[PDB]
């Protein structure tokens, strides 16, 4: 599913990502935009053979199992394809564990390079929330 901007914001808010670990909702929307373009079916292989899945491009090296990432972990105890559902519950819950790992949203390189230090609340502007 390709989410609408405010549609995704509302879904993330509902799931408690708004100000999770102090990251206002706009951070998560901004991140999702540059990770997946709001597409739950997004997948991208990394240089190391691991793959990123879903609206928040969660990595198979550490967080999910895709049957093909050698010497990887599965810290969110899920098959990676579960993250490609039109529903985002698995993504959001796994993201809560990631952003608590110590690095915050710097875990998402695209957030650090494209969202961090910007006016991220602009990503929820005009949204009814
Ligand atoms: Cl947009
Ligand atoms: Cl694997
Ligand atoms: Cl393969
Ligand atoms: Cl594991
Ligand atoms: Cl959802
Ligand atoms: Cl933090
Ligand atoms: Cl915000
Ligand atoms: Na894995």
Curated annotation (Swiss-Prot):
Domain C-type lysozyme: 1-129
GO process annotations (BP): cell wall macromolecule catabolic process; defense response to bacterium; defense response to Gram-negative bacterium; defense response to Gram-positive bacterium; killing of cells of another organism
PROSITE patterns: GLYCOSYL_HYDROL_F22_1, GLYCOSYL_HYDROL_F22_2
Coiled coil (UniProt feature): none
Domain of life, source organism: Eukaryota
Residues binding substrate, per UniProt: 101
Catalyses which reaction(s): Hydrolysis of (1->4)-beta-linkages between N-acetylmuramic acid and N-acetyl-D-glucosamine residues in a peptidoglycan and between N-acetyl-D-glucosamine residues in chitodextrins
Gene3D superfamilies: 1.10.530.10
Active site residues of this protein: 35, 52
UniProt key word Hydrolase: yes
Enzyme's top EC category: hydrolase
Tissue specificity of this protein: In the egg white and polymorphonuclear leukocytes.
Cystine residue pairs: 6-127, 30-115, 64-80, 76-94
One Gene Ontology CC term in the entry: extracellular space
Keywords: Allergen, Antimicrobial, Bacteriolytic enzyme, Disulfide bond, Glycosidase, Hydrolase, Secreted, Signal
A Pfam family recorded for this sequence: Lys
Major location (coarse): secreted
EC number, as in UniProt: 3.2.1.17
GO molecular function annotations of the record: beta-N-acetylglucosaminidase activity; identical protein binding; lysozyme activity
InterPro entries xrefs: Glyco_hydro_22, Glyco_hydro_22_CS, Glyco_hydro_22_lys, Lysozyme-like_dom_sf
Function in brief: Lysozymes have primarily a bacteriolytic function; those in tissues and body fluids are associated with the monocyte-macrophage system and enhance the activity of immunoagents. Has bacteriolytic activity against M.luteus.
Subunit structure: Monomer.
Protein family (similarity comment): Belongs to the glycosyl hydrolase 22 family.
Protein name in UniProt: Lysozyme C
Organism (species): Gallus gallus
Lineage of source species: Eukaryota, Metazoa, Chordata, Craniata, Vertebrata
Gene: LYZ
